[PDB]
Design a protein around this ligand. Structure first.
Ligand SMILES: Nc1ncnc2c1ncn2[C@@H]1O[C@H](COP(=O)(O)OP(=O)(O)O)[C@@H](O)[C@H]1O
Lengths: 864, 139
DNA sequence: TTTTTTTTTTTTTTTTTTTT
C-alpha cells in the first residue's frame, strides 16, 4: 500500500511502465474470462494478449524495474505450447537452509533429462527459490522454457516425477521431511509467475544457479550440464518467458472486482467481518443491515450477497431468495434510510480494541497517500478530507432559507452539554469542538507519519531515495506548524463545509410525529409500548422537552395524588375518561380530527389548573398559549401552533361573542394561510358564557361542550359532592415539582396508549353519556330567532328585540328572512301577488352512570 | 499560546454566546485594580479582551524569558556537535518568533482562539438564578 | 557566485457591517 505509492514516486521507470500500460496496452485489452490473454497483473487482474513486439518491450521494461529492485505482480499462463514450469512445496522439518550443491542440481538435471527422454524430443536450466526464512522452508521453481510441448505429456511427466524415488532420496539428503506433495499434480494447469513476481504479502523468487545442457537426437548419452557464465548480461525476464521464442540466451526447441473497485468496498468488508455473525443469523438484524447497505447506493448487491453465503442452511432455501426480495423492496423503499453509521456503532459495541486501530491504519494510509502526492505541501481541502474521514457521523451541515450554512452536532452522554440533550442533535453556528479536534486530536495521527518517515529514513537505502526522503521531511516540517494558524483553520472549515453538506436535512427535521425528545433521550410512540432510544439512532429530531420520562407507575404517591385530584375535579367517571382520552392525544403531532373542546363553569372550579399543567408538560417546544382575540376579532397570530400539539386560551373573565369567522379556519386539517398545516388539540375554558349564532349542519358536529359541576371555595359546604375545598397548593405550586411533571407525563402517555388500543386512535369512537348530552343542550340553547318567535316588520321587530335583550348591533335584513322562514313560522307562511313573503297567523303581543371500584383510571369495561 | 493563557491566567474570565451569536466575555473583578465604583467581587460583562492583551504582552514575555535563559544555559553546557547545532537552530527559530507576540494580527488570532478555549457551556442562563444572592457596593 | 537566503508579503482587516 504505502510502498506502492513510494515506488510510484521515487522510480521513473515505474512511471514509464504506467504510461506504457495506459497508452500502448490500452488497445490490447482482453476479456477477463477469455483465455487468449498471456499476461495478467495480479495487482489489477488485467488480462492482456500482447503481440511479440509488445511482449518484448514489456519483458525489457520488467527486466529493468526488477533490476533496481522494485515490486511487480504480473503472471503468465501456459498456452498450447510452453516450456517447463515446476513447483516444489518443500515443507521441510526445519526452516534452515541446507547447502545445496551444484553437483546435486546437475544430478537433478540428469534425472529430469531421463524423465523427458521417454517422450517427444528433438537446453538452459534455471533454478529459482524463495528468500527462505519462513515456516515449512521455501518453495522452488525450476524453469525450462526451451521446448514447446504443452499438452497432457506434461501431466504424464508430473505423474512420473510423483512416484520418482531418486528425487525424494536427494531431498532427504538435503534434509527434507516432505519428499512428496511438494510437486503439485496441477503444476502445469495453472498460470505461472515471471521472474521477480512475488506472491501477495510475500517476496519474489531469486535465481540460484543456471546450467546449460545441450541435447542430441542421435545419442543424448553425453551430457554437458556445464554451468552458464554471466547470466546478468541477458534480459532474464525476456529469456525466461515461456511465450518468448525470440530469446537470445534461450532457444525455442466477483469479490475480486469489488475489492479492486475503490477502497470503501474493502473497508466495509472489514468492518462487516469485525462484528460476530451472530446478528447475521437472525432474520431481523440481517434484514436491517441489508436494508442499510441497500439504502447506501446499489453497487453492494453482490457485497451483501457475499455476506449471504455465510450460514448456507439459512441462506439457501430461504435467505437466498428473500435476500433479492428485500433488495427489490429496498430499491424503492423510502420509509427509512439506515446508513453505515449504525454498522460502525455495532462494530463499536461488539468487537472493541480492534476497530480503533483498523480505522486508524485506514485514514493513516489515506493521509500518507495525500502527503506523498504533493511532497508535504498540504492545503485546506487536503486536511479537510481527512477531517471528514475523522467524524463522519458526528456533525452535519445544511443551508437555511437565508442561505447561511448551519451546523448540527449529535450530542451524546459523557460530554459537556446542557440539561436534557443526550443522544440527540443540537443546532450550532460555528464549529468549536471541531477546531480542537483538528488542532489536537488530528495532530497525533500525523505525528505517526512523522516517525513512520523517520523509520524509513533509519533503514538503509540508496543516495537518491535518501535525498528524496530528506526533501520530503523538510517540506513536511513547514506544514507541521500550519495545524495552528487560525486563517488556515478558517480555510479548512470553509472547504470542509462543502464536504459535510447533506441535502434535504433541515426540511425533514422533526417530520416524524411519533418521535418526541425528552430530558433523557427520545421516545417513539409509533408502537405500543413507546420505545426510549438511549443510544445511537438515525432520526431527525431537534425539538424536545426538559421532562425526563419514567414508566407509568400507579404506585407512585404523586401519581396517586394526581389521580385523586383529577377525579375530584370532575367526579363523573365517564366524563373524566372521555376528557382524559381527548387530552392524551396532544403528544401526537400528525393529522387530527376537526374538533375543538370548550367547557364552561360558574367560577373558582377545577379550570386553569390541569390546563396549565398540561401546557407546561408539553412545554414551549410542543405547546403555545393563544390570545382570546384570535376568535373574537372580526400576522404572527396565525403563526402560532406550528408543530405545537396543544392550543389553549387564557381565562376570559368577561363574556365574549364568537364572530362565526375563522372558526372553521382554525379547525379544518387542510391548508391554512404562507401555507402551513395545523396539527393540534384545542382546549378552552372560561367563567362566563359565549354567544353563538349559527345552525349549520357541519357546525355543532365539529364542536363539543361541557359544564363543570363542581365548586371550590374556602368555606366548605357539608354534604355537597358539588363543592370541595379549593387547594391553592394545586395552583401556585405542584407545577415546578419535576417528579410531579414526570408522573403527569406518564399518566398522559398511559391514557394515550389506552385510547390507541381501545378506539384505534379516534375520538369519534369513544363516547360519554355526559358528552353530547350537555353539548346538545347548549346546541338547543344559543338560539335567538326561534326564541324571539316564541316570545320587513318581522325582521325589524326581531332586530330591536335582539338589541334590547342581549346586545345592540348592526343588522342585515336580507338574509334573516331565510332563517325566519326556516323557523317554526314555515307553516304560517303565505304568498302575495306582489311576490312578497307577507305573514299570516301572527300578532305582535307587545304586552309583557356508574362508578369505579377503586380505580377510575382503569376505565372499567368498554361501557365505562 | 492560547493553551498557555488558559492554564496560567484562566481563572478570571469566561466566554459565552448570546442570542445574537456574538461572543461575549465576563470578568471577576478583584480589589485593587482600575474599575467602576462599588462592584467588587462580582462579574462584569465585557466585549473585547483588554487586560488579556496586557497580560499576553507583559507576563507571557517574562515567562518565555525563562525558557530563553534555560536554553542558553543548556547551550553553555558541554555537548556534542550535533546537539549544539540542534540547539542553535532552536535558538534562531525562537528568537525569530519572539517579536511575533507583539503582532496585532497574531494577538487577535490568540484572542479568537481564546474565545473558543475559554468558553463554558450554560453560563449566561445560569447567571443570577439564585434569588438569595444580592450584589451590593461592598460585595 | 550560486545556492540559499529571505522575505515581506501574507495575514488580519478593509470592508463586509445589515440593521430596523
Ligand atoms: N380537585 C381539586 N381538589 C381541591 N381543590 C381544587 C381541585 N381543583 C382545583 N382546586 C382549587 O380550586 C381553586 C379554583 O380556582 P381557579 O381554578 O383559579 O378558578 P378559575 O379557574 O375560574 O380561575 C384553585 O385555586 C385550585 O387550587
Amino acid at each position: 500500500t504505502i510502498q506502492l505509492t513510494a515506488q510510484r514516486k521515487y522510480l521513473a521507470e515505474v512511471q514509464a511502465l504506467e504510461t506504457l500500460l495506459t497508452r500502448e496496452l490500452s488497445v490490447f485489452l482482453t476479456e477477463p474470462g477469455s483465455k487468449k490473454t498471456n499476461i495478467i497483473n495480479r495487482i489489477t487482474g488485467k488480462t492482456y494478449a500482447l503481440p511479440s513486439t509488445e511482449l518484448l518491450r514489456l519483458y525489457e521494461h520488467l527486466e529493468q524495474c526488477r533490476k533496481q529492485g522494485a515490486l511487480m505482480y504480473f503472471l503468465e499462463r501456459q498456452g498450447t505450447y510452453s516450456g517447463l514450469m515446476l513447483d516444489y512445496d518443500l515443507k521441510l522439518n526445519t526452516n534452515a537452509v541446507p547447502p545445496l550443491e551444484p553437483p546435486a542440481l546437475s544430478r537433478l538435471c540428469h534425472r529430469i533429462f531421463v524423465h523427458i527422454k521417454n517422450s517427444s524430443v528433438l537446453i538452459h536450466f534455471f533454478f529459482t527459490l524463495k528468500p527462505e526464512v519462513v515456516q515449512g522452508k521455501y518453495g522452488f521453481h525450476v524453469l525450462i522454457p526451451g521446448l514447446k510441448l504443452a499438452a497432457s505429456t506434461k501431466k504424464s511427466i508430473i505423474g512420473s516425477l510423483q512416484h520418482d524415488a531418486t528425487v525424494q532420496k536427494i531431498l532427504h539428503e538435503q534434509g527434507v521431511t516432505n519428499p512428496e506433495s511438494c510437486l503439485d499434480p496441477h503444476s502445469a494447469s495453472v498460470p505461472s509467475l515471471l521472474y521477480g513476481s512475488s506472491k501477495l504479502n510475500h517476496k519474489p523468487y531469486q535465481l540460484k544457479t543456471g546450467f546449460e545442457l545441450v541435447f542430441d537426437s542421435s545419442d543424448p548419452d553425453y551430457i554437458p550440464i556445464h554451468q552458464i557464465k554471466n547470466l546478468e548480461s541477458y534480459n532474464l525476464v525476456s529469456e525466461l518467458s515461456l511465450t518468448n521464442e525470440q530469446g537470445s540466451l534461450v532457444r525455442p526447441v466477483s469479490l475480486s472486482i469489488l475489492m479492486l473497485h475503490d477502497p470503501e468496498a474493502r473497508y466495509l468488508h472489514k468492518i462487516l467481518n469485525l462484528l460476530p455473525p451472530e446478528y447475521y443469523v437472525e432474520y431481523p438484524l440481517w434484514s436491517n443491515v441489508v436494508f442499510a447497505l441497500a439504502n447506501t447506493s446499489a453497487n453492494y448487491r453482490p457485497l451483501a450477497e457475499w455476506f449471504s453465503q455465510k450460514c448456507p442452511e439459512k441462506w439457501n432455501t430461504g435467505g437466498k431468495e428473500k435476500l433479492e426480495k428485500l433488495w427489490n423492496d429496498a430499491s424503492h423503499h423510502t420509509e427509512k434510510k439506515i446508513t453505515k453509521r449504525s454498522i460502525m456503532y455495532w462494530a463499536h459495541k461488539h468487537a472493541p480494541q480492534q476497530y480503533k486501530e483498523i480505522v486508524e491504519q485506514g485514514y493513516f494510509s489515506i493521509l500518507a497517500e495525500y502527503v506523498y502526492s504533493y511532497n508535504g505541501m498540504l492545503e485546506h481541502y487536503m486536511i479537510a478530507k481527512v477531517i471528514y474521514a475523522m467524524m463522519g457521523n458526528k456533525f452535519v451541515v445544511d443551508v437555511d432559507s437565508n442561505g447561511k450554512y448551519v451546523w448540527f452536532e449529535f450530542v451524546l452522554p459523557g460530554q459537556p452539554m446542557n440539561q436534557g440533550e443526550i443522544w440527540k442533535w443540537r443546532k450550532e453556528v460555528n464549529p468549536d469542538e471541531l477546531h480542537i479536534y483538528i488542532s489536537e486530536n488530528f495532530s497525533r495521527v500525523m505525528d505517526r507519519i512523522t516517525e513512520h518517515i523517520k523509520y524509513h529514513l533509519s533503514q538503509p537505502h540508496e543516495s537518491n531515495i535518501l535525498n528524496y526522503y530528506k526533501k520530503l521531511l523538510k517540506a513536511f516540517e513547514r506544514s507541521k506548524s500550519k495545524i495552528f494558524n487560525d486563517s488556515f483553520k478558517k480555510g479548512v472549515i470553509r472547504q470542509a463545509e462543502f464536504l459535510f453538506r447533506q441535502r434535504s436535512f433541515i426540511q425533514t427535521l422533526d417530520t416524524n410525529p411519533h418521535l418526541l425528545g425528552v430530558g433523557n433521550g427520545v421516545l417513539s410512540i409509533e408502537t405500543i409500548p413507546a420505545k426510549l432510544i438511549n443510544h445511537f439512532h438515525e432520526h431527525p429530531i431537534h425539538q424536545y422537552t426538559h421532562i425526563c420520562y419514567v414508566p407509568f407507575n400507579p404506585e407512585n404517591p404523586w401519581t396517586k395524588l394526581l389521580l385523586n385530584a383529577l377525579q375530584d375535579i370532575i367526579p363523573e367517571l365517564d366524563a373524566r375518561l372521555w376528557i382524559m382520552f381527548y387530552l392524551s392525544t396532544a403528544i401526537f403531532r400528525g393529522l387530527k380530527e376537526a374538533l375543538m373542546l370548550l367547557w364552561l363553569g360558574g367560577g373558582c372550579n377545577g379550570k386553569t389548573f390541569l390546563m396549565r399543567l398540561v401546557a407546561m408538560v408539553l412545554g414551549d417546544h410542543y405547546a403555545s398559549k393563544l390570545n382570546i382575540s384570535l376568535l373574537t376579532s372580526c400576522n404572527s397570530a396565525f403563526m402560532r401552533l406550528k408543530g405545537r400539539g396543544y392550543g389553549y386560551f387564557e381565562e376570559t373573565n368577561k363574556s365574549e361573542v364568537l364572530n362565526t369567522s375563522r372558526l372553521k379556519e382554525m379547525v379544518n386539517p387542510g391548508d391554512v394561510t404562507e401555507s402551513f398545516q395545523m396539527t393540534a388539540t384545542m382546549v378552552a375554558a372560561s367563567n362566563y358564557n359565549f354567544i353563538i349564532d349559527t345552525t349549520d349542519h357541519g357546525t355543532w358536529r365539529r364542536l363539543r361542550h361541557y359544564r363543570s359541576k363542581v365548586k371550590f371555595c374556602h368555606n366548605p359546604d357539608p354534604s355537597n359532592p358539588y363543592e370541595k375545598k379549593e387547594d391553592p397548593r394545586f395552583i401556585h405550586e405542584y407545577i415546578m415539582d419535576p417528579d410531579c411533571q414526570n408522573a403527569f407525563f406518564s399518566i398522559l402517555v398511559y391514557f394515550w396508549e389506552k385510547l390507541q388500543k381501545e378506539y384505534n386512535g379516534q375520538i369519534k369512537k369513544v363516547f360519554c353519556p355526559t358528552i353530547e348530552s350537555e353539548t346538545e343542550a347548549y346546541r338547543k340553547s344559543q338560539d335567538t330567532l326561534h326564541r324571539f318567535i316564541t316570545e320587513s316588520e318581522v325582521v325589524t321587530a326581531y332586530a330591536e328585540w335582539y338589541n334590547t335583550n342581549i346586545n345592540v348591533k348592526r343588522h342585515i335584513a336580507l338574509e334573516l328572512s331565510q332563517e325566519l322562514e326556516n323557523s317554526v313560522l314555515e307553516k304560517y307562511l303565505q304568498w302575495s301577488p306582489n311576490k312578497t313573503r307577507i305573514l299570516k297567523g301572527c300578532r305582535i303581543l307587545h304586552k309583557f352512570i356508574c362508578e369505579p371500584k377503586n380505580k377510575w383510571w382503569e376505565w372499567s369495561p368498554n361501557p365505562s
